[PDB]
Design a protein around this nucleic acid. Structure first.
Ligand SMILES: [Mg+2]
Lengths: 141, 83, 48, 393, 107
RNA sequence: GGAGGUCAACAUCAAGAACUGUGGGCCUUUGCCUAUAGAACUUAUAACGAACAUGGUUCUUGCCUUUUACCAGAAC
């Protein structure tokens, strides 16, 4: 039942075993239970970081990928007289909405936007608390 | 010329008043504009009616442009307009 | 930087090339050679 | 604001914008005198969806894009000491204007059929002016005489008649009424300051003068532009002002992170939070608040990061609220920060002096400084009298 | 497939030459020794009379037509490759009067 | 005959979001249209591998006497 054979591929288990293994492995387990925690840390935010030559404050630094910024075009378009300086347009924004805030992106990918805001609730404190219980964190209804 | 407070469009309006023609903005439509440069400006256009005739004018720089019959705008003298 | 660089405005630029044009003319091309390329004109303007 | 990067490729970009307008219905595309193209869309993410479609699928060219900006509107605070008449002098007009009661506008932005005791939306003009007048006098403590006096309205505002020749010659005016409403729609679609829509401004028509012999097609045309200038002139003496849209922000967070949220609000400058609603059963909070449209450029990601991924935001307009921008719309002495955010003491002089530069109405060598001035329409001679009394700032 | 293609032969032959062609082919592809010959018989039928042979050949040429198309394309390609100031100025004058307020002339 | 094997051989595994067979009609086999049967494995925050190395050519750099050995980006 527990495995294919001596050839040893295709394992199959039961629930309680996986519960114990899941218990033992806590120091090496991933531990992060929602997608939404990685917001600008997924891959596509890093690629978009590289192509646009920015950095997430904890992310990696690469080379430019488009070494020449130096060419500048002068036209009435962006002139100061016609612009309103409100909000700084700081760097984190460029990676989130790359086609909007970043003029002239290239090799940019679409970042995935949002997830549903995990409310997941668990108790690792008491083993004798029931499975279904109304947790003090919740609002009183 | 930069000093002068008044703006053309105003002049056009004044001219129109004497004629009794009415100038209306027309929001969406626009026509590509050819001016000296090997480039075409884009400008919004308005239509003026004497009774129930509609013709469309786009003004860039200090000029009035009226479309040729086949199509494409041609600059014209302000006195040169009679509808 | 761009902000504190000289701004490009018709009054300004045209003054620059005007002055450079006249002084360009005064000296004969035989004695020396004065090209617009090498020259720098900075205009201090109400706008600059 | 779009511009194509390589100018010679403009004729391609145009052909893409004719597609996008179809495909994304909500988008509104405008082309200006500057030739600046104005894209108007619901928000951050929406502009992103376009610009990706516009760079990738439709027009393969690449394009330069401005900072996220907003749309203003123009209104009047106060009244019209002056009640001046403007003639294009066979026709002499005097048009007063005053603010509308907040409740009235609040019931206009929401089209409403007056079901039960609800205030009817004014859209029922074809209905009996006695029923409609019953609605107004009933709900608003509205004027009894004006209720009957009202002619017609438009999206942001209504028009009313108070004058003696109405009592002397109602018919001769009833001829050209349909002319005056044209001048009115023309008046509202543009504006005195930024040439942007007028909103919440009640126009009471004080007077109209008509020439001898009358006319046939002279009275047809000559009325519209003069009526327009009568509406601008009516406004500019009322204490005019620059309106900025306010998003109704809706936020959802875990409870203990509530303080963090609050900080962000205090930073934005537009906005404050009306409500904090416990969500029964879940460890969540709905925080309802408001922020200006022009201030909201980066809000969402600010929030979503700052709380470490717990939490959320949405920005939306329904109510189509608006609010005064804390400056005074016409002032020469406002401080223009030049590359800094202006001090709240004057933001309105800023926004208008900018939009004016964008919409090519006002010409300066570089920074034109021409105010929307009442003076131009009156003629100096009246103007000189007006300035003596401190009427004009 | 051309009659020449069917016989696997190359392209003004005489009535005599027409006979000789068949004779040569007969030696090579003799049916009694080794459907194709049906073509040979028919074409030979007209080719054996010099008149029919000539008329039949009268009606590579098409390909020449290809050359003509190429030439037409080349001709099209190579040959093809090989007041405003006054107006705006008048408008500028017209605005100046409006500014100065001097009455407009009847333009 | 059933279970297996740290056994082998031969097929197949990156594409019009995509496979194959068969029935019928048109052109003259291909191809198009229509009808019907079955589709293992791999793919949507895209892929056989919930993992992750090296080499070649060509550009751009970086160290900087020159070559191997190299710096870090790209395309194939
Ligand atoms: Mg050597």
């Amino acid at each position: 039942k527990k495995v294919n054979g001596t050839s040893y591929k295709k394992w199959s288990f039961d629930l309680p075993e996986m519960s114990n293994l899941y218990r033992l492995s806590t120091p090496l387990r991933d531990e992060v239970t929602d997608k939404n925690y990685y917001y600008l840390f997924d891959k596509k935010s890093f690629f978009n970081g590289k192509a646009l030559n920015n950095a997430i404050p904890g992310g990696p630094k690469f080379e430019p990928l488009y070494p020449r910024e130096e060419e500048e075009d002068y036209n009435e378009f962006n002139s100061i007289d016609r612009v309103i300086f409100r909000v700084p347009i700081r760097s984190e924004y460029k990676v989130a909405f790359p086609h909007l805030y970043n003029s002239r992106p290239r090799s940019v990918r679409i970042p995935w936007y949002n997830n549903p805001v995990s409310c997941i609730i668990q108790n690792d404190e008491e083993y004798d608390t029931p499975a279904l219980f109304f947790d003090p964190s919740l609002n009183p209804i | 010329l930069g000093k002068v407070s008044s703006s053309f469009k105003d002049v056009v309006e004044d001219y129109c008043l004497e004629k009794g023609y009415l100038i209306s903005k027309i929001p969406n439509r626009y026509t590509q504009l050819p001016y000296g440069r090997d480039q075409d400006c884009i400008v919004p256009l308005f239509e003026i009616r004497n009774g129930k005739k509609k013709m469309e004018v786009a003004l860039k720089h200090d000029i009035l442009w009226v479309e040729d019959s086949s199509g494409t705008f041609k600059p014209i003298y302000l006195w040169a307009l009679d509808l | 930087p761009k902000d504190s660089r000289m701004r490009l405005i018709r009054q300004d630029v045209n003054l620059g090339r005007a002055v450079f044009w006249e002084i360009q003319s005064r000296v004969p091309t035989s004695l020396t050679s004065i090209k617009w390329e090498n020259a720098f004109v900075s205009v201090y303007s109400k706008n600059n | 604001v779009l511009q194509p990067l390589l100018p010679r490729e403009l004729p391609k970009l145009l052909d893409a914008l004719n597609k996008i307008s179809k495909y994304y219905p909500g988008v509104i595309i405008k082309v200006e005198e500057s030739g600046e193209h104005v894209i108007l869309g619901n928000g951050e993410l929406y502009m992103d969806c376009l610009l990706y479609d516009l760079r990738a699928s439709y027009a393969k060219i690449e394009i330069k894009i401005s900072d996220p900006l907003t749309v203003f509107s123009e209104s009047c605070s106060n009244e019209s000491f002056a009640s001046i008449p403007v003639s294009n002098p066979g026709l002499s007009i005097s048009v007063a204007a005053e603010p509308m009661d907040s409740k009235m506008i609040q019931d206009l932005s929401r089209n409403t059929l007056g079901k039960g005791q609800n205030c009817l939306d004014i859209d029922g003009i074809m209905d009996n002016p006695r029923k409609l007048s019953k609605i107004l006098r009933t709900e608003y403590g509205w004027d009894s005489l004006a209720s009957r006096n009202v002619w017609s309205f438009y999206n942001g505002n209504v028009l009313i008649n108070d004058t003696l020749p109405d009592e002397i010659s109602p018919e001769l005016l009833s001829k050209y009424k349909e002319q005056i409403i044209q001048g009115f729609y023309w008046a509202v679609k543009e504006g005195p300051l930024a040439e942007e829509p007028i909103y919440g401004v009640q126009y009471k028509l004080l007077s109209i003068s008509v020439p001898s012999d009358v006319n046939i097609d002279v009275m047809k045309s000559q009325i519209i532009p003069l009526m327009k200038k009568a509406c601008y002139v009516g406004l500019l003496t009322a204490i005019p002002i620059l309106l900025e849209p306010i998003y109704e922000v809706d936020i959802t967070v875990h409870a203990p992170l509530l303080p963090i949220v609050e900080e962000l609000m205090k930073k934005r400058r537009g906005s404050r939070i009306y409500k904090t609603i416990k969500v029964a059963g879940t460890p969540l909070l709905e925080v309802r608040g408001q922020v200006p449209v022009i201030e909201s450029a980066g809000f969402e990601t600010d929030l979503r990061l700052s709380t470490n991924g717990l939490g959320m935001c949405q920005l939306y307009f329904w109510h189509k609220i608006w609010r005064k921008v804390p400056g005074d719309v016409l002032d020469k002495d406002a401080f223009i920060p030049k590359l800094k955010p202006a001090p709240i003491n004057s933001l309105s002089r800023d926004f208008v002096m900018k939009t004016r530069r964008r919409k090519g109405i006002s010409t300066g060598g570089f920074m034109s400084n021409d105010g929307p001035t009442l003076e131009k329409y009156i003629s100096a001679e009246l103007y000189a009298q007006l300035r003596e009394n401190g009427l004009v700032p | 497939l051309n009659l020449y293609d069917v016989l696997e032969l190359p392209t003004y032959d005489d009535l005599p030459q027409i006979k000789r062609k068949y004779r040569t082919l007969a030696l090579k592809y003799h049916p009694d020794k080794h459907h194709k010959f049906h073509l040979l018989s028919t074409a030979t039928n007209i080719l054996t009379n010099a008149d029919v042979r000539p008329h039949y050949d009268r009606w590579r040429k098409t390909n020449d037509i290809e050359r003509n198309k190429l030439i037409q394309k080349l001709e099209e390609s190579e040959s093809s490759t090989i007041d405003l100031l006054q107006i705006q100025r008048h408008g500028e004058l017209l605005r100046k009067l409006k500014h100065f307020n001097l009455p407009y002339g009847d333009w």
